[PDB]
Amino acid sequence: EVETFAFQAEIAQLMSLIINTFYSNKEIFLRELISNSSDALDKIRYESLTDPSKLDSGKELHINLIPNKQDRTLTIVDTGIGMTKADLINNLGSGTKAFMEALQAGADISMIGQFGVGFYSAYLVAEKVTVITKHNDDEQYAWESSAGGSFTVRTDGEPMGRGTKVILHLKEDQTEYLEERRIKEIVKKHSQFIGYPITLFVEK
Amino acid sequence: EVETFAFQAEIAQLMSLIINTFYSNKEIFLRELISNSSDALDKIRYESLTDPSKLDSGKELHINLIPNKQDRTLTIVDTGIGMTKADLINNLGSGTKAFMEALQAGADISMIGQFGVGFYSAYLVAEKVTVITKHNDDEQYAWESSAGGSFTVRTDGEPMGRGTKVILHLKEDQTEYLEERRIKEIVKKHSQFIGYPITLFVEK
Ligand SMILES: CN(C)c1ncnc2nc[nH]c12
Numbered sequence: 170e171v172e173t174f175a176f177q178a179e180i181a182q183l184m185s186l187i188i189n190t191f192y193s194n195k196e197i198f199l200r201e202l203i204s205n206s207s208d209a210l211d212k213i214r215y216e217s218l219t220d221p222s223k224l225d226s227g228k229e230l231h232i233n234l235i236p237n238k239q240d241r242t243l244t245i246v247d248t249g250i251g252m253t254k255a256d257l258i259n260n261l262g263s264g265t266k267a268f269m270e271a272l273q274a275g276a277d278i279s280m281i282g283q284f285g286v287g288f289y290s291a292y293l294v295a296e297k298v299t300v301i302t303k304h305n306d307d308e309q310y311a312w313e314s315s316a317g318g319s320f321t322v323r324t325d326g327e328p329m330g331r332g333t334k335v336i337l338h339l340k341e342d343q344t345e346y347l348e349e350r351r352i353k354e355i356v357k358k359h360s361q362f363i364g365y366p367i368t369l370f371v372e373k
Numbered sequence: 374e375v376e377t378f379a380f381q382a383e384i385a386q387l388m389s390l391i392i393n394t395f396y397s398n399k400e401i402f403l404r405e406l407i408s409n410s411s412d413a414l415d416k417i418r419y420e421s422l423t424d425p426s427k428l429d430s431g432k433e434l435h436i437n438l439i440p441n442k443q444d445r446t447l448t449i450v451d452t453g454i455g456m457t458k459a460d461l462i463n464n465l466g467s468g469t470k471a472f473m474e475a476l477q478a479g480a481d482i483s484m485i486g487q488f489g490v491g492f493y494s495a496y497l498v499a500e501k502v503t504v505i506t507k508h509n510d511d512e513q514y515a516w517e518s519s520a521g522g523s524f525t526v527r528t529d530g531e532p533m534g535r536g537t538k539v540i541l542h543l544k545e546d547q548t549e550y551l552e553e554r555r556i557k558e559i560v561k562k563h564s565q566f567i568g569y570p571i572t573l574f575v576e577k
């Protein structure tokens with residue numbers, strides 16, 4: 170059971186821009202994902218001040234980076250607040266327009282995060298993104314897209330607790346972001362101080 | 374009718390740090406306020422995608438900077454989502470601790486915003502802050518504090534629509550942030566691209 174949806178026309182345009190605009194500084198994507206993760210963690214955090222039961226599906230608030238050279242994927246995991254099916258379809262489906270009206274006036278792509286639309290920076294480095302997610306008031310869901318104007322949503326076995334898993338299947342010329350000294354350099358450089366623990370998994 | 378509350382002990386410590394730590398680069402405060410404002414606007418924005426009635430108390434989404442040399446105040450106004458009485462008391466009343474554990478390891482104060490606690494940067498420049506606020510599901514409220522460990526909350530006449538007014542009564546040696554070329558320099562330098570219109574009021 171698999172639903173296919175059209176990206177809203179402007180998200181398709183924004184995404185097109187990110188895939189086709191020549192831009193060497195692709196690395197800013199990680200910061201944009203870690204950044205989203207942090208916001209998600211701030212969210213389950215603020216909520217659980219007035220209502221602790223919410224951390225019944227995970228007490229620990231943190232971020233994992235999981236490289237896998239065999240699949241050629243980099244997974245950014247958090248145990249933040251998660252997405253309901255509706256959010257998956259909206260949130261990931263007007264900060265874009267500003268962004269272009271900014272891209273007109275001497276902004277560049279590295280400012281993408283300043284416009285609510287950092288997620289889509291994943292497309293600098295990834296041929297296909299899959300987003301597994303579990304919000305406290307819904308079941309677990311899988312979202313996916315290799316761009317080209319559509320996405321899919323299906324319910325996910327293999328239950329995570331509350332949280333989000335952003336899986337990057339990397340473009341073949343972007344496997345440097347699977348290397349450990351590459352990831353550490355990027356985290357130190359762009360996300361050095363951030364209110365949650367970040368674990369970089371090792372391989373095997 | 375005026376309630377006085379104690380800041381949670383760590384907020385009092387964080388605030389103390391900001392008032393007594395020698396740090397010349399005080400200007401980063403504006404970016405931290407404009408930044409909060411923007412988040413508030415993102416919030417009423419996301420909400421109103423699924424439920425337009427919410428913008429019944431204000432269709433227009435924007436930020437005003439209102440300098441007044443007679444009162445010696447700089448007001449940062451937004452028509453974002455607002456705060457309920459509860460949020461006033463919490464939200465403005467653990468990103469702090471991280472921040473210190475970061476301040477230990479070579480971070481400085483300019484990173485305050487990376488830790489959820491940018492609001493308190495107002496204290497670099499302001500002897501007293503007043504925050505007038507109106508959330509869709511509550512009446513209008515005034516919050517206040519000259520630090521020293523407490524704040525007040527009272528209901529506010531003079532109704533704003535939905536939104537937040539952060540009033541800075543500036544320290545007497547900080548009146549440069551009332552000058553127009555000073556504000557423009559700071560907005561251009563630190564908040565140049567941001568998803569909402571910013572109006573700098575002129576004086577008279
Ligand atoms: C909408 N958006 C980017 C997100 N919302 C909630 N949790 C997340 N974890 C990573 N990205 C997330």
Ligand SMILES: CN(C)c1ncnc2nc[nH]c12
Pocket residue numbers: 406409410413451453454455456464465492537539
């Ligand atoms: C908690 N916090 C800083 C705020 N929440 C909502 N609206 C705001 N406008 C300025 N600051 C705001």
